[PDB]
Amino acid sequence: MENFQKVEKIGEGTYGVVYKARNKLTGEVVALKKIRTEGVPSTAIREISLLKELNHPNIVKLLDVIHTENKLYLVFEFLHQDLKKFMDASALTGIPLPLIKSYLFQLLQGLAFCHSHRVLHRDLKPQNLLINTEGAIKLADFGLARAFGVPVRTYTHEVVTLWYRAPEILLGCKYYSTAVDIWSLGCIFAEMVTRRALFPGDSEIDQLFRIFRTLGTPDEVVWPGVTSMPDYKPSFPKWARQDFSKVVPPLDEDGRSLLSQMLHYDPNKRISAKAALAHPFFQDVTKPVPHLRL
Ligand SMILES: NC(=O)c1cc([N+](=O)[O-])ccc1NCc1ccc(S(N)(=O)=O)cc1
Numbered sequence: 001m002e003n004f005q006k007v008e009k010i011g012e013g014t015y016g017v018v019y020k021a022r023n024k025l026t027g028e029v030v031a032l033k034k035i036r037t038e039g040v041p042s043t044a045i046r047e048i049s050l051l052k053e054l055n056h057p058n059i060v061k062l063l064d065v066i067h068t069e070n071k072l073y074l075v076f077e078f079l080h081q082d083l084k085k086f087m088d089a090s091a092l093t094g095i096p097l098p099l100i101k102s103y104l105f106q107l108l109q110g111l112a113f114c115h116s117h118r119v120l121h122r123d124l125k126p127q128n129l130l131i132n133t134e135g136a137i138k139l140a141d142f143g144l145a146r147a148f149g150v151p152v153r154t155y156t157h158e159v160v161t162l163w164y165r166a167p168e169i170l171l172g173c174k175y176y177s178t179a180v181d182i183w184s185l186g187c188i189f190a191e192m193v194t195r196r197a198l199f200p201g202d203s204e205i206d207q208l209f210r211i212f213r214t215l216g217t218p219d220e221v222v223w224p225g226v227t228s229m230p231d232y233k234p235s236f237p238k239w240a241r242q243d244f245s246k247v248v249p250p251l252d253e254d255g256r257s258l259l260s261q262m263l264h265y266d267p268n269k270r271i272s273a274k275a276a277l278a279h280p281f282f283q284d285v286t287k288p289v290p291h292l293r294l
Contacts, residue, residue, distance in 0.1 A: 087126060123144075170231070199214070217236055244260055261276070
């Protein structure tokens with residue numbers, strides 16, 4: 001629209017295409033997301049509108065929600081790179097542990113803030129974690145999932161990544177809790193450390209079984225209530241749990257301890273963002289400057 005100036009097509013997300021754009025009057029450079037199909041549910045507009053007040057240094061700011069011409073555009077603060085691209089760029093050498101720790105700590109502060117305001121992300125992945133030259137990392141798209149359900153293909157035939165999905169979602173639990181975000185962040189923490197996705201499933205059952213093959217097939221002992229979950233099948237193969245020392249080497253025991261608490265099967269036992277911030281792993285946390293080529 002005439003209020004902007006499409007610089008580039010940042011890409012295509014699970015909701016629609018995103019453009020980098022400049023406000024013609026303010027000169028502000030922003031990310032503009034064109035949301036995907038009828039008359040835009042009023043329920044969704046109120047929900048989304050509430051997110052304009054969810055402001056925190058580690059949350060990508062939602063600047064405006066435009067519902068005009070019966071269309072919905074979300075205007076977000078712009079950051080130049082995402083964690084998926086940074087991890088790929090850092091693949092040869094790996095992201096230094098101090099920076100992995102800083103990013104994890106900042107992401108947990110972001111989740112702690114959102115969760116205390118009863119807002120869930122539900123679809124965290126490296127691509128929606130944005131970084132800047134100052135060493136900051138921010139969570140993008142918080143709250144969009146609620147009042148927008150779970151999609152299999154973005155807006156036009158594009159495979160939804162299941163790699164970071166918590167087991168309770170995969171087993172059909174309808175009532176997601178803040179624990180799903182801690183699970184996703186744990187998967188991302190492991191990926192930053194090993195430089196390979198932890199559970200790269202290519203189907204819902206492949207995702208579940210990859211989790212079971214690593215963490216053991218869950219049972220009533222470790223996860224009370226699991227055998228009564230909607231999609232649980234007594235026929236699931238029974239795999240033994242592997243040791244974390246083989247899962248994310250050469251991460252130290254502080255890191256393995258924290259990761260193990262972020263990947264507990266029982267969402268009720270899984271560590272909260274607030275409690276994770278107090279974990280000994282963060283005793284020596286700092287805020288390094290990443291090497292960014294833009
Ligand atoms: N708020 C955002 O800034 C931003 C928003 C979305 N989004 O809504 O889907 C995606 C990436 C973003 N930044 C990271 C980003 C920006 C530009 C490139 S590009 N076009 O130079 O490759 C890549 C990644």
